[PDB]
Design a protein around this ligand. Sequence first.
Ligand SMILES: *C/C=C(C)/C=C/C=C(C)/C=C/C1=C(C)CCCC1(C)C
Ligand SMILES: CCCCCCCCCCCCCCCC
Ligand SMILES: CCCCCCCCCCCCCCCC
Ligand SMILES: CCCCCCCCCCCCCCCC
Ligand SMILES: CCCCCCCCC
Ligand SMILES: CCCCCCCCC
Ligand SMILES: [Ca+2]
Ligand SMILES: [Cl-]
Ligand SMILES: [Cl-]
Ligand SMILES: [Cl-]
Ligand code: NA
Length: 241
Amino acid sequence: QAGYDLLGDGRPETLWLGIGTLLMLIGTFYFLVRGWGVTDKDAREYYAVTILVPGIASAAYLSMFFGIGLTEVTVGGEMLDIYYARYADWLFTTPLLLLDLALLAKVDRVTIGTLVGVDALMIVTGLIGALSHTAIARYSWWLFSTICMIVVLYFLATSLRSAAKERGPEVASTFNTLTALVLVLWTAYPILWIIGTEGAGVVGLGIETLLFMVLDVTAKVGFGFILLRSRAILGDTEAPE
Ligand SMILES: *C/C=C(C)/C=C/C=C(C)/C=C/C1=C(C)CCCC1(C)C
Ligand SMILES: CCCCCCCCCCCCCCCC
Ligand SMILES: CCCCCCCCCCCCCCCC
Ligand SMILES: CCCCCCCCCCCCCCCC
Ligand SMILES: CCCCCCCCC
Ligand SMILES: CCCCCCCCC
Ligand SMILES: [Ca+2]
Ligand SMILES: [Cl-]
Ligand SMILES: [Cl-]
Ligand SMILES: [Cl-]
Ligand code: NA
């Protein structure tokens, strides 16, 4: 695989895991220090949700760096490395990111429950496909989890977009910027997953880990950078509970 064996344990992908760990930690501390001088009740809610997104990713990338949670999967006569921490990362951070967008749109708790429910179903069925032993099952779960992603993305571009436009041009501008970013970044995940080691095997584990790291830092540090610098987080919020 493309990369360099930093720890001397036969894993060239630790170079991209180490870089991702640094970028997540730097982004976590940057949002944390920037949020200490924040007294607005609503802005503190966004900082609380957003800081956790690279903070949890930092722990997952640190665990994947040291090899904690690494195991093998046999699909015929080939051996596939799977990092459990990667999916546990997405299981926690994707609901928080959707919560950030739901706070901007100010949608009801039933809307949020359907959103995070389908989002979690997308992640679990993605892990199930990564653990299956036949290629037919791996593509079948990938297709099911992709459909669930489309359902989540459709709700952001239709229901949550219309509700956000009623809250004024400032929130609508920030919500449109983030949603435009989410529609393209999140779509890149099943594309890489199906062309990487878990799918056709076109992309090795090295480049896939590097590309997954770039998507992760952009969907977390880049997403939070656009949100936390906008004036929309000062507007009134209503947490689902
Ligand atoms: C901060 C981390 C984020 C926003 C991760 C997002 C991950 C996805 C949208 C993954 C989607 C997948 C499919 C739709 C097909 C099955 C395989 C997955 C889990 C890679
Ligand atoms: C009160 C506003 C929210 C009402 C939501 C009702 C629509 C529920 C859609 C359920 C979609 C399930 C997808 C299952 C996997 C494709
Ligand atoms: C208005 C339609 C809303 C739902 C659209 C969901 C699918 C988004 C497709 C984005 C395709 C990105 C292609 C670039 C990936 C490298
Ligand atoms: C023999 C050691 C080779 C080291 C090669 C390093 C290449 C540069 C890596 C830069 C990190 C990727 C940028 C990702 C930014 C999201
Ligand atoms: C308020 C900082 C959030 C960082 C999350 C750390 C998670 C520890 C496992
Ligand atoms: C919650 C972060 C766990 C990091 C584990 C590092 C283990 C180093 C031996
Ligand atoms: Ca306020
Ligand atoms: Cl403030
Ligand atoms: Cl206040
Ligand atoms: Cl590779
Ligand atoms: Na290594």
